[PDB]
Write a protein that binds this ligand. Structure first.
Ligand SMILES: [Cu+2]
Ligand SMILES: [Cu+2]
Ligand SMILES: [Cu+2]
Ligand SMILES: [Cu+2]
Ligand SMILES: [Cu+2]
Ligand SMILES: [Cu+2]
Ligand SMILES: [Zn+2]
Ligand SMILES: [Zn+2]
Ligand SMILES: [Zn+2]
Lengths: 334, 334, 334
């Protein structure tokens, strides 16, 4: 009975960070309370000024990551301010029943709702908006994120030995379908409603115009690169609510990877590239061994370099000549 | 020696049902006899009346599912009536040699053939037509289905504990390539032969016009929704003979999933979305816990909602507030 | 300390062969030395005479396979002759640091470099060229191959029992993006530089014009078919540096498959079709049981038969009626 449990209240943080949480814990089950507020807004998604008539949880693409433990109950207040134009809801893949909770959270602008469900399965799970008749549009316009349900005793390798991360990052990858006009330039829409018909037409081609991490080409580069140090273990959460992707860390590996994202299954080790099925979130651990700037990208290299599915990780620490050494620098052929 | 074994004769049933069979069995190996008759026919594949010049095993897309046990011999009589226009054959991925049996089953209209092979590997396996020089066309036009080879002692979890289903369903997903004329409307062809050249051109683009479960948009919805009750375990067999797909049960999970479809491998648990590689069949078990109407769909949501890769499962039983509860219904923001 | 180890020198061989090597070995770690020389060249890629302004390691698509053992150090001299027009480098997914070694191997025409890295993880790993600002183009133009790092004690099944192959083949699958002119014919370019802008435009559509094994439609067919005998175990290495593919052996299986390509993970058995993620190499073992001509192909059958992703394996030996028997040849319907 969930009514007998202590409630806790979690404050969410914006991607690529994930809110403070314990991995292995001595705590018994709780009702963990969250709130998210929907924001529709026009966003600039590339270097040339293309806009998207976007829809978001909490103002960001992806929505923030929610973290609980197996056996906890997730209790979400979903808010849809009167300043929004469309109805919304939420479908938690981590949840059982009522189309993931969509049927119980249909909120018009000016309304809110509170859903509770038992997080009875460990893993990273997609959540997304799913209003009847407009599901793909709300999803591709930005309305998805990840629920991470940790096992109560933390992550385990295939032999049941403990695994941990020192730092977690959350990456949402968005296949975007931005329409063009007769002049071949991308269209700019005054309102969200006006983008709809043209966007569906692009969607039906199955060819994205852009594929971006965290809402924009270069979102996770420069000042906004992810960070780590040699000897630190990072968890990279990767969600793709609509389309397949193949994450890869250049100069690195997936040390332990749950590509289907479900922690009761043994992870695979030493991966070069893994696979996130459209409509899922996966998770990879990597312990840095070399300093420098790494790229974390979709290894369809066109989707990465041409369409935008690539970020950077800047890693501090000491170079290791045993792992890699330039024996002879570039020089004239003898 | 297969010649020493008892023969049995199985009557096939139309998808989404699967013919009666045992899971774990005390029976020794048999020669299990089946017959299928090819039918070419024009089919209506969507709500607006688009037609496909279709080719089928037994009149349905997919063909019926054949069920045997590991160590059985499958003995198929393939019939190609004189009323058909094209030659056909059959390639069983569950079989060893002779291009899956295609080289031994080439049947012109007015002909038939009988193939036997040993079902020596457990799993769900694609079978499809594969005539020399026209393989993709016959496959994308509807000529595929599943052979399920059960382990003699039934299904097992990763720890070797017994698993079972109470009810099995078979879903074939078909990427269709319907041509358009200068007016942008889909073409309607008088004969199967006349659809050929235009269809190959669409195929080479790799963009399906439609992606359907079981031959038609909405095939598994309304009166034709799949059914179950709370507490019942369903096996969902999903075949895709030509293209990748990513099955998902909305409000549910894959409790135990063999996404590559081969039962001697441990299944994965708690999946949100799994992956069926083009040219394969996979299998998922789910035990219902909540009543209501679920969607079972390809989680490329464009492929599902726009192109047709989605069905429904209507589930009877009692709602469970512990698993999910609407705490506060939609109501004005305070 | 790698400086204390014996060096060995390996002579590479052209695909589809793989250079002689030991599987399980009593040898301790070595510095294994290789050399590759880059060659840009126009290649004919199909039956109708289409050309590609290609870029290669060692003159072939894919580059040759490099084989070492876990704990060895790979020491590559990369040569870029003055007869080439572009700068190049190499990114080993099998390596740790410096963007796979790309940052340490930037070679202009007339230059060379020597990189060493520790092959500390078992598996088949992609290597590819990756010059800053032109990564996808160099990769899709042909600059990838496989590093195989064998476990020192050879391959193992999920129970830790020994596995082996008698013969290894390496297949690189290349999604090509050949431009067309106003007349709808493929363009022929005088130089590599002139192909660039048009090619990027085709690439951004994500639709390949051709998808080929080993540089050309039909590369592994006729005189060039792969070969084996009944009772022989073959290792099929399959690399795809940019795009997903789904290998299948028609009339056969993947007996033991590492589809993510990393040997410290248990392989799956009995696969009909497996999955190579773009930006990875995978490996399958199969022991032939029937003689004849098999097809080894991408099981998107359009990508195989229409676009070129298919080869042949000619297998010698004695037919086995127990595995498969034509009971009644094609004959009039009674
Ligand atoms: Cu919404
Ligand atoms: Cu969903
Ligand atoms: Cu046919
Ligand atoms: Cu096949
Ligand atoms: Cu290059
Ligand atoms: Cu790479
Ligand atoms: Zn740590
Ligand atoms: Zn049951
Ligand atoms: Zn052998």
């Amino acid at each position: 009975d969930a009514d007998k449990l202590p409630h806790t209240k979690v404050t969410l943080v914006a991607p690529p960070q994930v809110h403070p949480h314990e991995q292995a814990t001595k705590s018994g089950p709780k009702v963990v309370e969250f709130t998210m507020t929907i924001e529709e807004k026009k966003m600039v998604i590339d270097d040339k000024g293309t806009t998207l008539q976007a829809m978001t949880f909490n103002g960001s693409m992806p929505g923030p990551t929610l973290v609980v433990h197996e056996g906890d109950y997730v209790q979400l207040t979903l808010v849809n301010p009167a300043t929004n134009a469309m109805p919304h809801n939420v479908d938690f893949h981590g949840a059982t029943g009522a189309l993931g909770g969509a049927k119980l959270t249909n909120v018009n602008p000016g309304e809110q709702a509170t859903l509770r469900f038992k997080a009875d399965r460990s893993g990273t799970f997609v959540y997304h908006c799913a209003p009847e008749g407009m599901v793909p549009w709300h999803v591709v316009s930005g309305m998805s994120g990840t629920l991470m349900v940790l096992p109560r005793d933390g992550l385990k390798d295939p032999q049941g030995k403990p695994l941990h991360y020192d730092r977690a990052y959350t990456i949402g990858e968005f296949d975007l379908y931005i329409p063009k006009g007769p002049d071949g330039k991308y269209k700019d829409y005054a309102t969200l409603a006006e983008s709809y018909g043209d966007t569906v037409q692009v969607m039906r081609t199955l060819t994205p115009s852009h594929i971006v991490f965290n809402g924009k080409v270069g979102a996770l580069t420069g000042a906004n690169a992810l960070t780590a140090k040699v000897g630190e273990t990072v968890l990279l959460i990767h969600s793709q609510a609509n389309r397949d992707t193949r994450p890869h860390l250049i100069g690195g590996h997936g040390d332990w990877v749950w590509e289907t994202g479900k922690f009761a299954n043994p992870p695979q080790r030493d991966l070069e590239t893994w696979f996130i099925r459209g409509g899922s979130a996966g998770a990879a651990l990597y312990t840095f061994k070399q300093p420098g700037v790494y790229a974390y990208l979709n290894h369809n290299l066109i989707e990465a370099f041409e369409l935008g599915a690539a970020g950077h990780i800047k890693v501090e620490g000491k170079w290791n000549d045993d792992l890699m050494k330039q024996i002879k620098a570039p020089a004239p052929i003898p």
